[PDB]
């Protein structure tokens, strides 16, 4: 295990948020983008190996980890469009013209947006369990509400009050998602889960994360733009963990309408957290895809 403190930590002031990140390695820039309920450290198993070939950059999304939580009452500051803008600003701030970009979960949408809005800043991309503009009707539909109920729980003030009421309550809540969304539970050792809980229990982090659901996944939300509804012919490497119940491999059928130059591989013994559950697959497929 490589604990958070065994990386080098940076912060950079962007136009309306401070972004925290770790950075390591040499070569072309590889930008790794996390999801919920993790943060930058979910990539910790692959950063080292990948840094042998890349300048690996791993930020906390705004509202996550040690990155700034914008005005918690202003949901416009938690829109995914701005999170994609943050990545362009991050590259500008670091003097980087082009990067390889990788995302999943919320960052699957960030990458979707990014490669279309900033096409000249991408070399190639990778997405794990990709999410397209046609996700919405499936995800909040029947019977998938059996899996997506939590997106609506997060709309309530009570969810924040309950989940942050104690470290014990927090651990209980988040453990369910790590385990249920994985191919083989437990996903995490006790020490690893403690580190995720440490992060969730930082001031405003549970609230910050739930604001993503309020801004982008309320029943009146629409996080997608016209530009998002275009075909991209950028080379994209896609993986799916067939054990993912919340963004299931059936959703491959939504991909061809948005991409003309991709690969897809269904990983048989992985769920929603590919970089945690099958880190060697991630390292191998990215090194191969981005050769």
């Amino acid at each position: 295990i490589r604990r958070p403190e065994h990386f080098t930590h940076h912060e950079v002031q962007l136009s309306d948020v401070k972004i925290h990140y770790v950075r390591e390695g040499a070569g072309p820039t590889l930008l790794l983008l996390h999801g919920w309920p993790g943060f930058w450290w979910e990539w910790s198993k692959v950063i080292g190996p990948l840094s042998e070939r890349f300048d690996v950059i791993v930020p906390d999304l705004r509202g996550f980890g040690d990155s700034e939580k914008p005005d918690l009452s202003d949901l416009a500051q938690y829109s995914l469009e701005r999170v994609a803008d943050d990545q362009a600003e991050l590259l500008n701030a670091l003097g980087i013209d082009q990067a390889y970009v990788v995302g999943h979960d919320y960052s699957a949408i960030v990458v979707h947006k990014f490669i279309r809005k900033y096409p000249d800043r991408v070399v190639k991309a990778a997405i794990f369990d990709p999410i397209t503009p046609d996700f919405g009707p499936f995800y909040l539909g029947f019977p998938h509400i059996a899996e997506s109920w939590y997106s609506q729980f997060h709309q309530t003030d009570m969810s924040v009050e309950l989940v942050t009421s104690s470290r014990e309550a927090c651990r209980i809540y988040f453990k369910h998602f790590f385990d249920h969304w994985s191919y083989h539970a437990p996903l995490l050792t006790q020490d690893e889960l403690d580190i995720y809980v440490d992060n969730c229990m930082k001031p405003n982090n549970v609230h910050g994360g739930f604001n993503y659901y309020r801004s982008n996944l309320s029943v009146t939300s629409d996080p997608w733009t016209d530009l998002d509804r275009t075909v991209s012919d950028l080379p994209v490497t896609m993986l799916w963990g067939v054990g993912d119940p919340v963004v299931p491999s059936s959703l491959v059928h939504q991909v061809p309408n948005y991409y003309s130059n991709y690969t897809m591989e269904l990983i048989q013994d992985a769920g929603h957290f590919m970089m945690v559950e099958k880190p060697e697959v991630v390292i191998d497929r990215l090194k191969a895809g981005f050769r």
Copy 2:
């Protein structure tokens, strides 16, 4: 306030469960049936006044309050059809030929079932915010999942673990439903909420209640029978609290397909807990309806 201990408590052994109830008054029998997340005591404001005209009987549903929790692993023992059977058995056990029956929430379904399955055991009925066989597609549909998410949360083991992890967690969770489902929050005084929490924290009561959702409201559940899909011409008094967001007054449109002899009244300053929020309305309308 009339605390639980200021009533007379009974238990009776039915064919496969022990049912706890309180009983008070003289006259025709009036059977009052509670919902989730309450228990018999939610009727405590109206029992006394109604007992001036009726033999008021108020049981805990199986799986609730001080009634027996059947085998927690056997969801068939938490089907609403059996809960309706329990009411027929209760009347048999007490030597009662016919009763006036009143329900809401889960007991709206119990009464729906009861008056059709045991039509000769009913004088007249009343339902608050009634639920019909056509409820399902609306309730788990879009956008109502913003309100019904909790029915799916309850499918998880983690929900029980979290909500029972401490009295504080329990209070936080249940308070949301009392307040959000009411017309004007707070619904309850601190002492009143403590009493509901005391009950929820009794061994197996949170689990017992969540089993109702697992048996009757999973995405593969079907609690309705062919007999339920028949028109009843029994006199039924119906009330709706227009402040009810989870079973909203729009659902009046589903009632005419199932009833030919009813009244309906929309109460302007009540939500989901009519007997708690507007007890004088309940007393008046039942005394009038059942004259």
Copy 3:
């Protein structure tokens, strides 16, 4: 029986029609609005009793009874929107700021329109067997044409010629509707039917009534406005006669889209003419509803 001549008769000149009415009693103003094939006198059983608590005003609609028949060739003068305007003008002319208003049949639409167009002139309203903007497709649909055929018969010149060809033909025709639309035929004694026939046989009254069908119920008619398609939160007392075959109690399902503050009661032994068949119910429910 209280014959027409045993009331006090008035006429008032409104902006484009003379309206005939009877008036009786003291208290808040209660405006009672008749339908087809009756006239003001259909209310004759309840006027006296209601006048003990209200200033009861009962007009003939334009085109009916002793009220003026506008230009029989001008269907715009028989639109229901103008009939609703007539009621506002009547109140103005009598120096009345606000009234309780009651309607059924055609006057169900008049009241629908009135309470939305002149909301400041209503205290509370009542409608019997209410008709909403969604009536049309049901009423002229299949199989309801078995009941609504007469609305299309009335489009023909031959219908007027036939029905007015003799007092005997007139009696034969109208008796069918009084009896078939009631819960228990005969609706009327011989003397009562003679009085309705006397009125129908007045010059232009059959034609006047049929013009309502030509203006508002032809296959190219549209009597509803945008304003009519709004929700009203005025207190409205609604009754349905379950024996009504032409505006059946199934149509309760159309009401919730237009009203948020109402009561509904299905009367088991009444049809389309509640004030004729169950006058004591009408008196009781209006006195109660408008207390």
Copy 4:
């Protein structure tokens, strides 16, 4: 004009009805079948001319004219299937192996049925304004109820009472249909209309005719058989009067599904009564079609 008494009148006892007919001429047998509200005499203008080339046989349908009215309470005896059977029996009784058959209105259905059920008894057929098994949804649909309302009026006892209440009422009623269904009103001279009224006023004839509507055109009627829903390749000559509003020329589109060997001609100045309004067209087209 050739009055009824200027023909030779016959009656024949068939298996369950007595059928009246007139007969004239020599050659192949030509069977002419009338509709509502006429009887055999509507063919009176063409019988003479056609008898120069054919053995013309013109019956009253059961329930019409001077033919027997079966048990007026037994609607099964007014089904169109039996009326088609009557034509086969008529031919048998007269020792006729094959005939040319012509129908319209109700007899359009009779001929439809006849040529499929008794195909070996037909040489060729002709239908004016033909009616197929797909008629129903159009005819009782919206907006055609503006034209078909009378089929539902006839379901009522009051319709018989009203229309037979006097010769004057009878004349008024039937004149509407002769005139409105024709291309150019008036269809008839005064003397001609008097003859139709004489026939309608014969005992039970209005009732008999209305029973056709009750048996075959109620909202729960189904006069068509499986055999009727087959394609016929018999030679069929079809005419349409474009002035026919009740069976309009748009209904040509329903014909190709049922016929593979036909002609169609739209007559520009005729309505529903081709043999009355354009007798020379009828004579010419039948002589030509049946050469």
Copy 5:
């Protein structure tokens, strides 16, 4: 047989094409319009007989026969709208105010267009196996692609290369359509087929014909105008060959939406080439229809 050289041949310079035609007879002008894969000579059996009563004019369509092939790369010059314009120009050029016009196949569309765009230049019209604006979805639909495949073959350059590769290849190809589209194959004698092949093998004639398919029957083509979607009340004589598999007699159902003054006759032993397979029927029906 009347060979091409036994007619009198003309050419006239119209505004953007030279049109070749033959002309014969005296009387009102009768304009006969051919289809694919023929040319003017397909009418050769009926021209003589018809010339006894008419001034018969029979042109090659632009792109066919000896008429000019416009710029083969410019599909706008092969639109059917311009082919209809050519007929108006032809009449102008010959000093003819009005003509009887007859078409089938592609010329069914030409006549459809012509009688609506130049209504004052038509006396009466005739169409064989008529084609309306609603043809498209049927013709390129399933299962009719089993018959319409050739319209898509013609989109390819290879079709021209193959079909013109030799006289033998040409004969093989076109013979299929003459025979398969007829009621009884063979349609043609050997000498007659040789004459059609002679014409197809003229420079650019196969290409010219295939351009009709490219301009008017590609999957992105739309040859119809708003004016084409109007009802015509011009007298139109229509025939159908029931043996036509490519424009089948079922399509009669599309005709009533576009015509209010027509006749239709299904010819039992004819297919797609009525003037070739049943010339005496054509002569008789046109002489009769245009009397």
Copy 6:
């Protein structure tokens, strides 16, 4: 170029056909299955390289190449189900328990069928431009008939007569498909095309190939079984040539319903003939996929 004669040729007698094949190499068995309009030799560029790691077996499908043409009048002998059975028999006859199987075009269906019907005879599979049971409605739908027209041309006797009329006609026809279905035309050198034409011109080979279309792709054909409509969890390597217009890369969306364990890669500069246009990709991806 490696000409046909530079391979070793075999024939084996199976239960109802003689199958011709070439075979080369050592290792696990790799069975390569061709499509239309090729034969075994389309694999000629990859056989040698692949034989370094595999026992490569490459048969002509029944009805193709030098394999037997069953009774040309018996379409049941050209059903794809029997072609899949032939592969099981081939393996049995050669004493092979399991093979890697690769297909495209018609053999995409053969492999689909094979891996489900004979699951114990497959190690892993690969499909190029895969075809599933949901292909039909797309392929013969609109607008894809612009591409699929040839499947219906092949239903006609004339297609065989035309295409085999000379070597020149044959070359012209087949060249279109090699070129139009490829990413960059020309697909073939002149010598390579001559070899394909040599094969097509062998007795009955054009007819044999067209029989595949008659048996499996007529508008009344159904080549799929219930077993075909099942999910396979065999490892399958899939490639798509994005330049393929007849089986386009959009059809990836049909794959997830039938496979749970696959990879997909869109090749940017290949069309329908991956093994011909991008042989090094085929060699690399199969060696990698089947390691």
